[PDB]
């Protein structure tokens, strides 16, 4: 859909994110709904003191006065303005749902860690030198806040001068960052060419023209012409952005230039898709099938196997007529020792106490997935349709998962008819895709499996 | 058991290993069976138990100045993928599905010919800031450790992360002067001082074998915190069905309460209540999979064909197996469950701690008679107390397993 | 419900909390589900290697190398973190208008509970943080002994007070001032607490009279199954000495049968508060069978003698009811409107307005803990029809566990709700007052009925 | 405007006042119109009177007063402002908390009608100096008690303490006196500043005592100009105007303003919509819909004054209603009158205005009686697009603040 450069980045970074060794380096722009910070305009506060930008040297020497109360007060004012100007965004949420375990930032706000906790992840937040010595138990991500934290205004780093005065507190973070930039693939975001600290930091952690360096990525927005402005001003900003991109290129950081900041979100969304569509939920139970039971068992079997063969992950509720053969199909390929990311089994607890929490149990096992495949769905009560499978359908759809009901294996059929009719509400688009979906509701086992697999692959755009 | 310093190290490094943030830097000593010391080097070394224990630990970072390929070899023998780095360019790539990174700075015995080693210095500095290191295989005669450390560590930060180095105390040689010995001691002391200046604590052992023991202990600390719950039941000994259900339920619930992990085969009559007990504590205030791993058995000929490998696979995850009940239904009647006995056997062939709560009774007698073969030490009262009330039995089991997990 | 001493405490502390100047001091026990901490077992993770010998540990911890301190702190705090959880106590406390929390805990349970209740917490565990004032804060949380995410700076032993007064004295000063000015509830402290007596010895004076009264809730020591009686009477003696020491600082100790009673007590307090802000639901074009002026005057004096008895009113300003609620309020207040006495939330009309009516109503009712229902009729297509809005407000009211009081005598939809309550009455009011409820289906008498009913609720 | 130090103080103390964490410590100077003081206490009491400072302070949301004065000027000013004062002069009174109090007044040296017993007060003051930002005022270098008290309630070894402030007047030369005597007095003032500085109390030296009043006025302005009263009932199409009201409200709320509304027909619902779009509700939106009927209209006037009292700036929109079958709404004009009698900034948007226009023209003429000062004149006249008009309004009121 998007331009070839953006697509290439999406695929490469998807690869790096999925291997769970990618890092995010977040600027102040990420903490703004508009996607950027007008650094000059943010600092109207000196107009509120009558010190128009001569007075700046007096301000600098007031700030750098031996009495740290000065530093604390000014930090408090600026920080407060920042806090009064920031908000949580979908970017933070998407990033929080991604398997990213390393965040670097120069932001004071707690948006990243907040997004992490809202996703029930444990964040190891480090903004002091001593905190680098500790390791939080059961942490899912580390968040390095170099320039300090909003709840500690006097210790906050606002200007590069601190690096010069207090290297003992800044150098360990610089060391850590250098190492990470050697070892992890970074995405720089929220930085513009007017950012006051990025070039310094990069100059402290990266070598110029140094060959064979790890390639990192940075997303920015294209500079566009303003209505009431001379063309020299526009070409000025264009030139500045060009120099910024060149400097970033010197450190093997490839810059991707978007038309607008919203594209960032889109990109992130796409990346998440690429991830979530690789863990599949297999819904279904059966006592009855119009194939021979053993043959159907083999259908489920090799469906699972050629799910696993194509690097997919399976989460199963262990349906009576389906689960055992899913397991068999998985084990055929794995025992040639079970990786935990390939097959996750969640058999349902029987009894009153289990059924009391079966719903939360289902939501819990389906949350792990981004695509739900539906097979059969019958049980013994009297042969009766299994309501549980349709419930799993509902939960899947309220969770924005791609729904793939195999109508050949007729409750599955019922949902395939509920979706095939009124089809725009489930798959807004038409592409092979419409034909493939229709091809699921009496071919061979290989053919049907190929249909399902290729449909699910088409889903991961 | 050991002296307080080693125990403290064991605790800190256990935490770091379990948190998958530990690193190892291996000197030439680790590649020697005796624990101490070009073309000849490769011709004089091969694999040791330390390498195997390390390979079994969830350690993802190895730094070394050795040319031998013992680390990567040990890792592969444990069926794990090693990302081996000896060139600058290789740092830009990340090997897919890797379990550990192995930085071999001074090059590798393969690729003999292999300044511009700056990226490795960056990586090591960062790692020393963020990861807890164990230095091992280094003596005071090592030509490179002090240089590398002088390039990757600052002596002006006191609040930095603590690292460790294990060495052996210098001992007097048969028939040698005392001045020469005191010379060697003085030099080892200076070595310790030099390491201390970079906040690397040196622990001095009586012998190199103690290294192994320490490692063993560490492994224990990990493996004993994931429990395998074996058992199935239609009848429940001398309790009411519902009552047994409350027993299994809350046993599971305070297995989870004391930070234990559960692996279950979801046996009929046990599994659902293990699950319930877990969910009660876990749904308080999603299921982390490092907390509960369910491995229900596939039914049918094709499943039973690999039930054995399936069982060994699920038990491999654990270091302690608790055994409950073990009865089934074969033809209308209650019959002992062979599966629990199989899981017991597999547990013991895997050198796992076996805890049968008196088929359970049968295994408790198998353990109580040959008790020197299962638990060399004395515990003895609790084990006998496993064969009371529900709270009492649960506390017995849990505190016993706790004693195992020192 | 409970013994006169506990009830008395409930009234006094309810009074102190309601003026929004009460403070809580929380010990480690509050961060436990069982309500207490066995300090020895806490010491064990350091005692597990080699357990006279304690001076070696003391000198290791107090060694020039701060790595020692960091390590020991890390181990002990980690044990804490693996042993703590959030409790109903935290949630109840977080819903209460308490703006001052003191604690020696490292955990972030208090701040967590506050934030889950959408309150902004100014958390201070460093000296410098005392110099700051967090914008839009609802409560201050002083963590005197540090924070769990800053293990190396954590205060474990009293020794720090002796070594670093520059870091501890400001907190001591603040605590002293607060204990002079705010009424405190001590909870989570037992006689085995390693620091409380020291801290009290530095922030309170003994035998000096006219001190502010504070409160401490503990559980009586009980005998353990199969153990000698001397150990029990030992623990009893220790608890008695502890109570005596707290009494010495004008801190009254209340001794409960079990820790759950803490929760119960807290619950009661919350009740006493939440039932004092009333939501008045109702709109009317017709007023059952009374003359308009008479019914309007009923609403009027209902509001006026709700306020006369120190109640608070939140109104959606329904047509036929709202204006007269306002009138009734103004008669009593204009004798200058305090904000928490009357909160008016008139509904925005139009499609864009109706788009958020549900959230608007939930927002209204959340401020309140008891909802009174009057009438509920409007014109729908030319004729008088029942107002579904009142029914919705009822649903939302009960889903938020607010006490629902439908006046069926002056009512249409109100009457409907009176039947909804009289039927399945065990689902709304577990207890026996039944007559007062029945009297809801004169003006002075009806108002007295309503008011004494809601008063009985508190 | 004023010097950067004073401005910084104004912003910091404004924040502390707004967060209801500011405290005042009053010396004898505050009880004197001349701003300073040159058996004795009887004469002193017979020599004091109420000042604008006391009123400004009483109008501010300040809940903590410490004083060494014997006079009752603080509590008097508070009670004249219809506030409840918890007055403390004994130790036992510290154990009690007066209900519905708005401010506490520590009279640690007693009261004129109230002719060890220090320790609880010392504790309270120490704590307050740790947690609350103080303004010391009415103290000169000849004051006999300030240094003692400070030495008893503050540590000189704590450097990272909360910063407090003390306002004094610069020593000036007296008509015909030697330069050595003047330099003597200057030296003493400088040493005084040093002594306060040792306790981390920053001293701001003003040109004259009235500047104290000016500073306080500025602070009060900063407070009252942050709550806006939206006046109006109801050129453009109805939906467009409704969205105009909507987004005006919406980024009035977005720019940290507070709205008080009488919920006028044609305006109220859209003010509400605009507020909730930005948004559960805090002190950001106070709705005071008018009660209909004879009894309500009997109290509509007091109702309006109470409304507008919460605010310091009133914006006027439209103002039309249906009577006996479109007619000007006298109520909006009444709200204008009350607004001006309450010293509120009047911002009538005469653009899409009816009565708003009448008042905007009433303002354009005799413009000096509403805004004593000039450009601002262009912005007032500008009262275009919707974004442009709302931005005009917002920038006008922002210039006001």
Author numbering:
A (entry chain A): 2 to 44, 46 to 55, 59 to 294, 296 to 342, 346 to 391, 394 to 421, 423 to 443, 445 to 454, ...
B (entry chain B): 2 to 38, 84 to 160, 173 to 343, 346 to 418, 423 to 442, 446 to 454, 458 to 476
C (entry chain C): 2 to 52, 59 to 342, 346 to 442, 446 to 454, 459 to 475
D (entry chain D): 2 to 39, 82 to 158, 173 to 291, 296 to 340, 347 to 392, 394 to 443, 446 to 453, 458 to 475
Question: Which text from the study accompanies this structure?
Answer:
To further investigate the role of ThsA in Thoeris-mediated phage defense, we determined the crystal structure of B. cereus ThsA. The asymmetric unit contains four ThsA protomers (chains A–D), the structures of which are essentially identical. The protomers form two dimeric assemblies (AB and CD), which are very similar to each other. Consistent with this prediction, SEC with multi-angle light scattering (MALS) analysis confirmed that the tetrameric state of ThsA is predominant in a solution containing a trace amount of octamer. The protomer structure of ThsA revealed a two-domain architecture that consists of an N-terminal sirtuin-like domain (residues 1–283) and a C-terminal SLOG-like domain (residues 284–476). The N-terminal domain contains the Rossmann-like fold, in which an extended seven-stranded parallel β-sheet (β3–β4–β2–β1–β5–β6–β7) is sandwiched between two helical layers (α1, α5, α6, and α11 on one side and α7–α10 on the other), comprising a three-layered globular structure. The acetyl substrate-binding pocket of sirtuins is not available in the N-terminal domain of ThsA due to the blocking by its α7 helix, excluding the possibility that ThsA serves as an NAD+-dependent deacetylase like sirtuins. A structural analysis indicated that this domain could be classified into the Sir2/TIR-associating SLOG (STALD) family within the SLOG superfamily. In our crystal structure of ThsA, this residue is found within the putative NAD+ binding site in its N-terminal domain. Using liquid chromatography–mass spectrometry (LC-MS), we identified nicotinamide (Nam) and adenosine-5ʹ-diphosphoribose (ADPR) as products of NAD+ degradation by ThsA, implying that ThsA cleaves NAD+ into Nam and ADPR by hydrolyzing the Nam–ribosyl bond of NAD+.
